[PDB]
């Protein structure tokens, strides 16, 4: 059952744009009713077993990020098999973390695929828009 995971996806500079953008939208973004979704879990089963334990769990738990980061997948996968590798190229790599970071602050987003699918794409295109710094306090000779 598995052995060695992959390396790195995004860059150190690219990841910053995702964490800085997700943290800037959080404040303006509204919160989700945790008490409401709670009762929904006891009523359902697939949702309770899928990402229900995460709702009941705490916030300051290393296991939480491990459960969300793993579940937070729209393009990439969570298992390397065969000699294949056609899933992530560059854009999808950003959409993964772009949404994984949102699921953290918004545990409810885990259920909303359409919403999270539109949010991740927002940051995914933003990072691709710009790249590296051109000038700084004027010209740049070198």
Curated annotation (Swiss-Prot):
Tissue: Isoform Short is found in myeloid leukemia cell line KG-1.
TM region(s), chain numbering: none
Location(s), subcellular: Nucleus
Positions of region (NCD2): 40-129
Disulfide bonds listed in the record: none
Chain positions of cross-link Glycyl lysine isopeptide (Lys-Gly) (interchain with G-Cter in SUMO2): 31
Stated role: Acts as a transcriptional repressor for zinc finger transcription factors EGR1 and EGR2.
Protein name: NGFI-A-binding protein 1
Coverage span on the entire protein: 189 to 317 of 487
């Amino acid at each position: 059952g598995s052995s060695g995971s992959s390396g790195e996806a995004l860059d150190a500079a690219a990841a910053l744009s995702v964490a800085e953008c997700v943290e800037r939208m959080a404040p303006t973004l509204p919160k989700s009713d945790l008490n409401e979704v709670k009762e929904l879990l006891k009523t359902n089963k697939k949702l309770a077993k899928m990402i229900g334990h995460i709702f009941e769990m705490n916030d300051d738990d290393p296991h939480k990020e491990e459960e969300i980061r793993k579940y937070s997948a729209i393009y990439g996968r969570f298992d390397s098999k065969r000699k294949d590798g056609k899933h992530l190229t560059l854009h999808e790599l950003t959409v993964n973390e772009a949404a994984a970071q949102l699921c953290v602050k918004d545990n409810a987003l885990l259920t909303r695929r359409d919403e999270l699918f539109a949010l991740a794409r927002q940051i995914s295109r933003e990072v691709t828009y710009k790249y590296t710094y051109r000038t700084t306090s004027g010209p740049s000779s070198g």
